[PDB]
Amino acid sequence: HMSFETRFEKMDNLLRDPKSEVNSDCLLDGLDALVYDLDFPALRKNKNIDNFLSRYKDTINKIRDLRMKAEDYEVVKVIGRGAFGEVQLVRHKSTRKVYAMKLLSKFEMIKRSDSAFFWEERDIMAFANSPWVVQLFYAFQDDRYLYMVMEYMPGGDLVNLMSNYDVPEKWARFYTAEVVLALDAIHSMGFIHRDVKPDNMLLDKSGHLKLADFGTCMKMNKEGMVRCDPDYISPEVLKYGRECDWWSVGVFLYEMLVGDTPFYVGTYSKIMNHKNSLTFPDDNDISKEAKNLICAFLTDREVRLGRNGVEEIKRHLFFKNDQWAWETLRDTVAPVVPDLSSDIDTSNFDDLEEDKGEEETFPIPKAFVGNQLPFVGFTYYSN
Amino acid sequence: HMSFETRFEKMDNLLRDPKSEVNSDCLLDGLDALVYDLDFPALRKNKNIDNFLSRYKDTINKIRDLRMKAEDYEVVKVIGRGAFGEVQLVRHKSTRKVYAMKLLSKFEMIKRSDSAFFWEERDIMAFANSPWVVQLFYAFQDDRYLYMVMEYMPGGDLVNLMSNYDVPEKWARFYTAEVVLALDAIHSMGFIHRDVKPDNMLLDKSGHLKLADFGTCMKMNKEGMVRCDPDYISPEVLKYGRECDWWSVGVFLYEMLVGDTPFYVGTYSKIMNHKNSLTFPDDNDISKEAKNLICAFLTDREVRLGRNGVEEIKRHLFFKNDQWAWETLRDTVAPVVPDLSSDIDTSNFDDLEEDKGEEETFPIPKAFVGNQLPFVGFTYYSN
């Protein structure tokens, strides 16, 4: 019950607003997903399909050439692998710009009945629009792969850092602070990251931190929590709010200083008995400032620090230094500034093998399968 | 093989250009056609479909409310019926404007395997953009009906005119001229109308003519002709170029003056023997100017007038009058100016009965039927 004028306006907004699922980029996916999942000699016996396909065939064949495609990016190297795909250092052929491009096998996702996990990662990386989060520039689908073009982080994760250095407190103070800010940014959007691991934490050219690889992420409820049923699991989740995340930071900090996980398959029982299993090494030259903070995080959900707000954490004297203050944090010098020669230098990154594998495909169907249907709305362009 | 910049530009043009089949209005049809032809408890057993539908269900339900729908227009009266649908005088509820809205039963079109006929009508009415052609403002689909909102022509067709008047030459000169211009406009687009009947020729408020109901219309070949295999059939078609159309005008003119069709199931043999069956009545007070023109049209395709150009026809002295000249033709007074009281006056139109019929529907399918698929891309908005 509105006026034609105002109705017609709001339709144009829904087709422009990049957050909308009826974005004009989202709609082309829906058409392409039809042509992919209908162009089969078996299904093309049906007349309606035969004609629809014929009509749009010459069109969509032109559209595929013009929209962003895998052939636009030449593969430099594989900077990481995981479950359901890999990540590649890429260079745009035309613009001559380096990016990090994450692939996701459509077959494997469908094979194991697991599709709706990337959505939350996409939402965050694109719209977060902060200096603590690895930004997504372009995203595009394919016959058999999802692509995510995002900025190259040439400093590598912290896993390799910690392994190649004896981390002093001065460094732990910094890398903790940059996490604490990053994680608050995500909370401000209304999402709760889970299993915040050193694996996620990447380093930019300057040596500063940005988070990425946002799996096990869900949207906060109307209360500000999540109703859902490994060592980064809090008693909260094991028996889920924002407290969940602060636990995995207390773990993180303990790892940098002690050089092992806090709670060492029965490990779940040590997490529950958090009161009578908080042990430190014999020569704990770890300052009392750190031991204080780590214990403040690693405790029962009720009393766990951060329940009132993030500002509690910043007050802690563990952060109170001379070099930087929270607002000037990302502007200061970093503990480890990666010195790289070329703009394609993957020295901090591990050297993994190239694909060297025959790609598996779906069997050609006899009826409408709709394997491409769950991926509709994924594509995104950043102007 | 282009630059990213120029490629990205051309995509935005294809999504704006109203003539394109990937217009952002065309793409929403493709999404709506999925939801219509998948939301069936039988098909929703498939998981991919179940989830896709669930995700977009709340979205598309909102989109249907906002896009143009049948409920926006209240039905005044039925001003005509035909095969595969009817035409209604309508008033837009919000803007309070009268239009003529043509419906087309999706069921009947599918039932009798006949779908791709409206396309050409749409192309013409929308883009013709001349004062001789009934213009299409909005077009929109439904679960079971195609709609075409076009300007109301309150003067009626010429069939009712000729029946309610003793048509003098002065009138025949005029109504012929306005046809000759109208038909040239369509030729300039690159289309060839067939069976140009008094049924098609409608009258505006002023009393001037506009063509409509563009069935049996096809696009001109690269030569300027058509390779295709009742009384308006020329020997050309019966044994097809632009000459085809000039034949049906010569018929038209003969009907106004003689008051019967020229060639009276064996009628096809009289059309072939056009040389030895051109008879006029006993008291042919029909001027020699008219008898000349009618014979010039109604002859073999080779010699038939108009083969060289439309300008031949305008030279003919049958048109040479004092009142008007070709450019000032539509600006002059019309022979019959319809005097109507209300803005919803259908006095010139026949009074047909209202629908009063249970609408037939498709049987609920067990597999992907795709009955809505051939109608994708029909919708059109005129800003």
CSV table of C-alpha atoms in Angstrom, one decimal, chain B:
chain,number,residue,atom,x,y,z
B,1,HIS,CA,40.1,-9.4,-26.0
B,2,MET,CA,39.4,-6.0,-24.5
B,3,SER,CA,40.4,-3.9,-21.4
B,4,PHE,CA,38.6,-4.5,-18.1
B,5,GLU,CA,37.4,-0.9,-18.1
B,6,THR,CA,35.6,-1.2,-21.5
B,7,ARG,CA,34.2,-4.7,-20.7
B,8,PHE,CA,32.7,-3.6,-17.4
B,9,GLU,CA,31.1,-0.6,-19.1
B,10,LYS,CA,29.4,-2.6,-21.8
B,11,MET,CA,27.9,-5.0,-19.1
B,12,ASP,CA,26.2,-2.0,-17.5
B,13,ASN,CA,24.8,-0.9,-20.9
B,14,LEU,CA,23.3,-4.4,-21.5
B,15,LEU,CA,21.6,-4.2,-18.1
B,16,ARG,CA,20.1,-0.8,-18.9
B,17,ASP,CA,19.3,-0.9,-22.6
B,18,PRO,CA,15.5,-1.6,-22.6
B,19,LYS,CA,15.9,-3.5,-25.9
B,20,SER,CA,18.3,-6.1,-24.3
B,21,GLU,CA,17.0,-9.5,-23.1
B,22,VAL,CA,19.4,-9.2,-20.1
B,23,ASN,CA,17.6,-6.0,-19.0
B,24,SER,CA,17.5,-6.0,-15.1
B,25,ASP,CA,13.7,-6.2,-15.5
B,26,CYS,CA,14.1,-9.3,-17.8
B,27,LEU,CA,16.3,-11.0,-15.2
B,28,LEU,CA,13.7,-10.8,-12.4
B,29,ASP,CA,11.3,-12.7,-14.6
B,30,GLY,CA,13.9,-15.5,-14.9
B,31,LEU,CA,14.1,-15.8,-11.1
B,32,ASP,CA,10.3,-15.6,-10.6
B,33,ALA,CA,9.9,-18.3,-13.3
B,34,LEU,CA,12.1,-20.6,-11.2
B,35,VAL,CA,10.2,-20.1,-8.0
B,36,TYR,CA,6.8,-20.6,-9.8
B,37,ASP,CA,8.0,-23.8,-11.5
B,38,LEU,CA,9.9,-25.3,-8.5
B,39,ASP,CA,7.6,-24.5,-5.5
B,40,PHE,CA,5.9,-27.9,-5.6
B,41,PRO,CA,5.9,-30.3,-2.6
B,42,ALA,CA,6.9,-33.1,-5.1
B,43,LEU,CA,9.9,-31.2,-6.5
B,44,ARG,CA,10.8,-29.7,-3.1
B,45,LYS,CA,12.0,-33.2,-1.9
B,46,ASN,CA,15.2,-32.4,-3.8
B,47,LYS,CA,17.4,-30.6,-1.2
B,48,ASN,CA,19.2,-28.1,-3.5
B,49,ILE,CA,15.7,-26.8,-4.6
B,50,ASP,CA,14.4,-26.9,-1.0
B,51,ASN,CA,17.2,-24.7,0.2
B,52,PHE,CA,17.3,-22.3,-2.8
B,53,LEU,CA,13.5,-21.8,-2.5
B,54,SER,CA,13.7,-21.3,1.2
B,55,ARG,CA,16.4,-18.7,0.9
B,56,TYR,CA,14.7,-16.6,-1.8
B,57,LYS,CA,11.1,-17.2,-0.7
B,58,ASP,CA,10.8,-14.3,1.7
B,59,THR,CA,12.6,-12.1,-0.9
B,60,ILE,CA,10.6,-12.9,-4.0
B,61,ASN,CA,7.3,-12.7,-2.0
B,62,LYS,CA,8.3,-9.1,-1.3
B,63,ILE,CA,9.3,-8.4,-5.0
B,64,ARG,CA,5.9,-9.6,-6.3
B,65,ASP,CA,4.2,-7.0,-4.1
B,66,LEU,CA,6.3,-4.1,-5.5
B,67,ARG,CA,6.6,-5.0,-9.2
B,68,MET,CA,3.6,-4.2,-11.4
B,69,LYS,CA,0.7,-6.7,-10.8
B,70,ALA,CA,-2.8,-7.3,-12.0
B,71,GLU,CA,-4.2,-6.0,-8.7
B,72,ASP,CA,-3.0,-2.5,-9.5
B,73,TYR,CA,-5.6,-2.2,-12.3
B,74,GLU,CA,-9.4,-2.3,-11.8
B,75,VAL,CA,-11.3,-3.7,-14.7
B,76,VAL,CA,-13.8,-1.3,-16.3
B,77,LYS,CA,-15.1,-3.4,-19.2
B,78,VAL,CA,-14.1,-6.0,-21.8
B,79,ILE,CA,-13.6,-4.1,-25.1
B,80,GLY,CA,-12.7,-7.2,-27.1
B,81,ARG,CA,-11.9,-10.9,-27.1
B,82,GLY,CA,-9.9,-13.3,-29.3
B,83,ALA,CA,-7.9,-16.5,-29.4
B,84,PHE,CA,-5.7,-17.0,-26.4
B,85,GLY,CA,-7.0,-14.1,-24.4
B,86,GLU,CA,-9.0,-10.8,-24.2
B,87,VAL,CA,-8.6,-7.0,-23.9
B,88,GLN,CA,-9.9,-4.9,-21.1
B,89,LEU,CA,-10.4,-1.2,-20.4
B,90,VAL,CA,-8.5,-0.6,-17.2
B,91,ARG,CA,-7.8,2.2,-14.7
B,92,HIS,CA,-4.6,2.4,-12.7
B,93,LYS,CA,-5.7,2.6,-9.1
B,94,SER,CA,-2.9,4.9,-7.9
B,95,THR,CA,-2.2,7.2,-10.9
B,96,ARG,CA,-5.9,7.2,-12.0
B,97,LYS,CA,-5.2,6.7,-15.7
B,98,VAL,CA,-7.1,4.7,-18.3
B,99,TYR,CA,-5.4,2.1,-20.5
B,100,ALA,CA,-6.2,-0.9,-22.7
B,101,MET,CA,-4.8,-4.1,-21.2
B,102,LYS,CA,-4.4,-7.2,-23.3
B,103,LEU,CA,-4.3,-10.6,-21.4
B,104,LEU,CA,-3.0,-13.9,-22.8
B,105,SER,CA,-3.8,-17.2,-21.1
B,106,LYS,CA,-0.5,-19.0,-20.3
B,107,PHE,CA,-2.4,-22.3,-20.1
B,108,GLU,CA,-4.0,-22.1,-23.6
B,109,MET,CA,-0.7,-21.0,-25.2
B,110,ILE,CA,1.1,-24.0,-23.6
B,111,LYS,CA,-1.8,-26.3,-24.2
B,112,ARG,CA,-1.8,-25.8,-28.0
B,113,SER,CA,2.0,-25.5,-28.3
B,114,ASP,CA,2.0,-21.8,-29.3
B,115,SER,CA,4.2,-19.3,-27.4
B,116,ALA,CA,6.5,-17.3,-29.6
B,117,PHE,CA,4.1,-14.9,-31.3
B,118,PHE,CA,3.8,-12.1,-28.8
B,119,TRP,CA,7.6,-11.3,-29.0
B,120,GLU,CA,7.3,-9.5,-32.3
B,121,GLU,CA,4.2,-7.6,-31.1
B,122,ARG,CA,6.1,-6.4,-28.0
B,123,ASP,CA,9.2,-5.4,-30.0
B,124,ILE,CA,7.1,-3.2,-32.3
B,125,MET,CA,4.6,-1.6,-29.9
B,126,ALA,CA,7.3,-0.6,-27.4
B,127,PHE,CA,10.1,0.6,-29.7
B,128,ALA,CA,8.2,1.8,-32.8
B,129,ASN,CA,7.7,5.1,-31.0
B,130,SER,CA,5.7,6.6,-33.8
B,131,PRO,CA,2.2,8.3,-33.9
B,132,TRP,CA,0.8,5.6,-36.2
B,133,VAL,CA,1.4,2.7,-33.8
B,134,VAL,CA,-0.4,1.9,-30.5
B,135,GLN,CA,2.3,2.3,-27.9
B,136,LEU,CA,3.1,-0.2,-25.1
B,137,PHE,CA,3.8,1.5,-21.8
B,138,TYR,CA,4.1,-1.4,-19.4
B,139,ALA,CA,4.2,-5.2,-19.8
B,140,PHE,CA,4.3,-7.8,-17.0
B,141,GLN,CA,3.8,-11.5,-16.3
B,142,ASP,CA,1.8,-13.4,-13.8
B,143,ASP,CA,1.3,-17.0,-12.5
B,144,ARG,CA,-1.1,-17.6,-15.4
B,145,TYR,CA,-1.4,-14.5,-17.6
B,146,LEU,CA,0.7,-12.1,-19.7
B,147,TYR,CA,-0.4,-8.4,-19.5
B,148,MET,CA,0.2,-5.6,-22.0
B,149,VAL,CA,-0.8,-2.1,-20.8
B,150,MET,CA,-1.2,0.1,-23.9
B,151,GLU,CA,-3.0,3.4,-24.7
B,152,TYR,CA,-6.8,3.3,-25.0
B,153,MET,CA,-8.1,3.9,-28.5
B,154,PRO,CA,-11.7,5.0,-27.9
B,155,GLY,CA,-12.7,5.5,-31.5
B,156,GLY,CA,-12.9,1.7,-32.2
B,157,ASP,CA,-11.8,-0.2,-35.3
B,158,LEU,CA,-12.8,0.6,-38.9
B,159,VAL,CA,-14.9,-2.5,-39.1
B,160,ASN,CA,-17.6,-0.8,-37.0
B,161,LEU,CA,-17.0,2.5,-38.8
B,162,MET,CA,-17.6,1.1,-42.3
B,163,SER,CA,-20.7,-0.8,-41.0
B,164,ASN,CA,-22.3,2.4,-39.5
B,165,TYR,CA,-21.5,4.7,-42.5
B,166,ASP,CA,-21.8,5.0,-46.2
B,167,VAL,CA,-18.1,5.7,-46.8
B,168,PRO,CA,-17.5,8.4,-49.5
B,169,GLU,CA,-14.2,8.6,-51.4
B,170,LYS,CA,-13.1,11.7,-49.3
B,171,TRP,CA,-13.0,9.4,-46.2
B,172,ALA,CA,-11.4,6.5,-48.1
B,173,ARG,CA,-8.6,8.8,-49.3
B,174,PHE,CA,-7.9,9.8,-45.7
B,175,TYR,CA,-8.1,6.4,-44.0
B,176,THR,CA,-6.0,4.9,-46.8
B,177,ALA,CA,-3.3,7.6,-46.4
B,178,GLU,CA,-3.0,7.1,-42.6
B,179,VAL,CA,-2.6,3.3,-43.2
B,180,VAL,CA,0.1,3.9,-45.9
B,181,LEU,CA,2.1,6.0,-43.5
B,182,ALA,CA,1.6,3.6,-40.5
B,183,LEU,CA,2.7,0.6,-42.6
B,184,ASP,CA,5.8,2.4,-43.8
B,185,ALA,CA,6.8,3.1,-40.2
B,186,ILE,CA,6.8,-0.6,-39.5
B,187,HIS,CA,8.8,-1.3,-42.6
B,188,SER,CA,11.4,1.2,-41.5
B,189,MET,CA,11.9,-0.8,-38.3
B,190,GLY,CA,12.5,-3.9,-40.5
B,191,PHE,CA,9.3,-5.8,-39.9
B,192,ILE,CA,6.6,-7.0,-42.4
B,193,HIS,CA,3.0,-7.1,-41.2
B,194,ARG,CA,0.8,-9.7,-42.7
B,195,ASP,CA,-3.0,-9.8,-43.0
B,196,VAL,CA,-3.4,-6.1,-42.5
B,197,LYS,CA,-7.1,-6.0,-41.8
B,198,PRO,CA,-9.6,-3.3,-40.9
B,199,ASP,CA,-9.7,-5.2,-37.6
B,200,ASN,CA,-6.2,-3.9,-36.7
B,201,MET,CA,-6.9,-0.3,-37.6
B,202,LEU,CA,-8.0,1.6,-34.5
B,203,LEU,CA,-9.0,5.3,-34.1
B,204,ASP,CA,-7.7,7.7,-31.4
B,205,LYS,CA,-9.6,10.5,-29.7
B,206,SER,CA,-9.1,12.9,-32.5
B,207,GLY,CA,-10.4,10.4,-35.0
B,208,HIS,CA,-7.0,9.6,-36.6
B,209,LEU,CA,-5.6,6.1,-37.1
B,210,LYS,CA,-3.1,3.9,-35.3
B,211,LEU,CA,-2.3,0.2,-36.0
B,212,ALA,CA,-2.2,-2.6,-33.5
B,213,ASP,CA,-2.6,-6.3,-32.8
B,214,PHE,CA,0.6,-7.2,-34.7
B,215,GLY,CA,0.2,-10.9,-35.2
B,216,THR,CA,1.8,-12.8,-38.2
B,217,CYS,CA,4.7,-10.3,-38.0
B,218,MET,CA,8.3,-11.3,-38.7
B,219,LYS,CA,11.6,-9.5,-39.0
B,220,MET,CA,13.0,-8.7,-42.5
B,221,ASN,CA,16.0,-10.7,-43.7
B,222,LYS,CA,19.4,-9.3,-44.7
B,223,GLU,CA,18.0,-8.9,-48.2
B,224,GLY,CA,14.8,-7.2,-47.0
B,225,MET,CA,12.3,-10.1,-47.4
B,226,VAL,CA,11.1,-13.1,-45.5
B,227,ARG,CA,11.5,-16.9,-46.3
B,228,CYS,CA,8.5,-18.6,-44.7
B,229,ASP,CA,6.5,-21.7,-45.6
B,230,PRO,CA,-7.2,-15.7,-45.7
B,231,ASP,CA,-8.4,-13.4,-48.5
B,232,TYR,CA,-5.5,-10.9,-47.7
B,233,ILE,CA,-3.0,-13.5,-49.1
B,234,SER,CA,-1.2,-12.2,-52.2
B,235,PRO,CA,-0.1,-14.6,-55.0
B,236,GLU,CA,3.4,-13.9,-53.6
B,237,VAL,CA,2.6,-15.8,-50.3
B,238,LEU,CA,0.2,-18.3,-51.9
B,239,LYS,CA,2.7,-19.8,-54.3
B,240,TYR,CA,7.7,-13.1,-49.1
B,241,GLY,CA,8.7,-9.4,-49.3
B,242,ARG,CA,7.3,-5.9,-48.5
B,243,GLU,CA,5.0,-6.2,-51.6
B,244,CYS,CA,2.9,-8.6,-49.4
B,245,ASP,CA,1.6,-5.7,-47.4
B,246,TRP,CA,0.6,-3.4,-50.2
B,247,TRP,CA,-1.7,-6.1,-51.5
B,248,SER,CA,-3.8,-6.1,-48.3
B,249,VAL,CA,-4.2,-2.3,-48.6
B,250,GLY,CA,-5.6,-2.6,-52.1
B,251,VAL,CA,-8.0,-5.0,-50.6
B,252,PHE,CA,-8.8,-2.6,-47.8
B,253,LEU,CA,-9.6,0.2,-50.2
B,254,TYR,CA,-11.8,-2.0,-52.4
B,255,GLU,CA,-13.9,-3.0,-49.3
B,256,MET,CA,-14.6,0.6,-48.3
B,257,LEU,CA,-15.9,1.6,-51.8
B,258,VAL,CA,-17.5,-1.6,-53.2
B,259,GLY,CA,-18.7,-2.9,-49.8
B,260,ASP,CA,-17.4,-6.5,-50.3
B,261,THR,CA,-14.1,-8.4,-50.5
B,262,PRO,CA,-12.5,-8.4,-54.1
B,263,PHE,CA,-11.9,-12.1,-54.5
B,264,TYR,CA,-15.0,-13.9,-53.1
B,265,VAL,CA,-11.7,-22.6,-50.4
B,266,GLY,CA,-11.3,-22.1,-54.2
B,267,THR,CA,-11.0,-18.3,-53.4
B,268,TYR,CA,-7.2,-19.0,-53.6
B,269,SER,CA,-7.7,-19.7,-57.3
B,270,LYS,CA,-9.3,-16.3,-57.8
B,271,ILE,CA,-6.3,-14.7,-56.1
B,272,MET,CA,-3.9,-16.5,-58.5
B,273,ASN,CA,-6.0,-15.5,-61.5
B,274,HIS,CA,-5.8,-11.8,-60.5
B,275,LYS,CA,-5.8,-10.7,-64.1
B,276,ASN,CA,-9.2,-12.2,-65.0
B,277,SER,CA,-11.2,-11.7,-61.9
B,278,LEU,CA,-11.0,-7.9,-61.1
B,279,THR,CA,-14.7,-7.0,-61.3
B,280,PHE,CA,-16.4,-3.9,-60.0
B,281,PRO,CA,-20.2,-3.3,-59.5
B,282,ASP,CA,-22.6,-2.1,-62.2
B,283,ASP,CA,-23.0,1.4,-60.8
B,284,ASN,CA,-19.3,2.0,-60.2
B,285,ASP,CA,-19.6,5.7,-59.2
B,286,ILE,CA,-16.2,4.8,-57.7
B,287,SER,CA,-13.9,7.3,-59.4
B,288,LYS,CA,-11.4,6.2,-62.0
B,289,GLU,CA,-8.7,7.5,-59.6
B,290,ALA,CA,-9.7,4.8,-57.0
B,291,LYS,CA,-10.2,2.0,-59.6
B,292,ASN,CA,-6.7,2.8,-60.8
B,293,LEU,CA,-5.0,2.6,-57.4
B,294,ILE,CA,-6.9,-0.6,-56.4
B,295,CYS,CA,-5.8,-2.3,-59.6
B,296,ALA,CA,-2.2,-1.0,-59.1
B,297,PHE,CA,-2.0,-2.8,-55.8
B,298,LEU,CA,-4.0,-5.9,-56.8
B,299,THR,CA,-1.7,-7.4,-59.4
B,300,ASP,CA,1.2,-9.8,-59.7
B,301,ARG,CA,4.1,-9.3,-57.2
B,302,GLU,CA,6.6,-8.2,-59.9
B,303,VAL,CA,4.6,-5.2,-61.2
B,304,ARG,CA,2.7,-4.5,-57.9
B,305,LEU,CA,3.1,-0.9,-56.9
B,306,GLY,CA,5.5,-0.1,-54.0
B,307,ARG,CA,8.3,-2.5,-55.2
B,308,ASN,CA,10.5,0.5,-55.9
B,309,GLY,CA,9.4,2.5,-52.9
B,310,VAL,CA,6.6,4.0,-50.8
B,311,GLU,CA,7.1,7.3,-52.6
B,312,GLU,CA,5.5,5.9,-55.7
B,313,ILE,CA,2.2,5.5,-53.8
B,314,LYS,CA,2.2,9.1,-52.5
B,315,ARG,CA,2.6,10.5,-56.1
B,316,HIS,CA,-0.8,8.9,-57.0
B,317,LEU,CA,-3.4,11.5,-57.8
B,318,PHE,CA,-6.0,9.5,-55.7
B,319,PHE,CA,-4.4,11.2,-52.7
B,320,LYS,CA,-3.9,14.6,-54.3
B,321,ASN,CA,-6.4,16.7,-52.4
B,322,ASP,CA,-6.6,20.3,-51.1
B,323,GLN,CA,-7.4,19.7,-47.4
B,324,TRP,CA,-4.1,18.0,-46.4
B,325,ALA,CA,-0.6,17.0,-47.4
B,326,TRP,CA,1.3,14.0,-46.2
B,327,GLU,CA,3.3,15.8,-43.5
B,328,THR,CA,0.2,17.8,-42.3
B,329,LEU,CA,-2.0,14.7,-42.6
B,330,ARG,CA,-2.3,13.8,-38.9
B,331,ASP,CA,-2.6,17.5,-38.0
B,332,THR,CA,-5.8,18.0,-40.0
B,333,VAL,CA,-9.4,17.4,-38.9
B,334,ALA,CA,-10.5,13.7,-39.2
B,335,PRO,CA,-13.6,12.6,-41.1
B,336,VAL,CA,-15.1,11.0,-37.9
B,337,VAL,CA,-14.2,12.6,-34.6
B,338,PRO,CA,-15.7,10.4,-31.8
B,339,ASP,CA,-17.8,12.5,-29.5
B,340,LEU,CA,-17.5,10.8,-26.1
B,341,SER,CA,-18.8,12.0,-22.7
B,342,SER,CA,-16.8,10.2,-20.0
B,343,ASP,CA,-13.1,9.2,-20.3
B,344,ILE,CA,-14.2,5.6,-20.0
B,345,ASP,CA,-16.7,5.8,-22.9
B,346,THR,CA,-16.8,2.5,-24.9
B,347,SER,CA,-19.7,3.6,-27.2
B,348,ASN,CA,-17.7,3.0,-30.4
B,349,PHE,CA,-16.6,-0.4,-29.0
B,350,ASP,CA,-18.9,-3.5,-28.9
B,351,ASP,CA,-20.2,-4.7,-25.5
B,352,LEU,CA,-18.9,-8.2,-24.8
B,353,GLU,CA,-19.7,-10.3,-21.7
B,354,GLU,CA,-17.4,-10.5,-18.7
B,355,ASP,CA,-15.1,-13.5,-18.0
B,356,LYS,CA,-17.6,-15.5,-16.0
B,357,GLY,CA,-15.4,-18.6,-16.3
B,358,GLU,CA,-13.4,-21.0,-14.1
B,359,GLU,CA,-9.8,-20.6,-15.1
B,360,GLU,CA,-8.0,-23.8,-16.1
B,361,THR,CA,-4.6,-24.6,-14.6
B,362,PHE,CA,-1.7,-26.9,-15.2
B,363,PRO,CA,-1.6,-30.3,-13.3
B,364,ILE,CA,0.9,-30.1,-10.4
B,365,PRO,CA,4.1,-31.7,-11.8
B,366,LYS,CA,6.4,-34.4,-10.4
B,367,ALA,CA,9.4,-33.3,-12.4
B,368,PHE,CA,10.7,-30.0,-13.8
B,369,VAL,CA,8.1,-29.0,-16.3
B,370,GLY,CA,9.3,-25.4,-17.1
B,371,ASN,CA,6.0,-24.0,-18.3
B,372,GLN,CA,6.9,-20.5,-17.3
B,373,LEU,CA,10.3,-20.7,-19.0
B,374,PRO,CA,9.2,-19.6,-22.6
B,375,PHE,CA,7.8,-16.3,-21.2
B,376,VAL,CA,11.0,-15.1,-19.6
B,377,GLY,CA,12.1,-11.6,-20.8
B,378,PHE,CA,8.6,-10.3,-21.6
B,379,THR,CA,8.3,-7.7,-18.8
B,380,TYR,CA,8.9,-4.0,-19.8
B,381,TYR,CA,8.7,-0.7,-18.0
B,382,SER,CA,8.6,2.7,-19.7
B,383,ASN,CA,10.3,4.7,-16.9
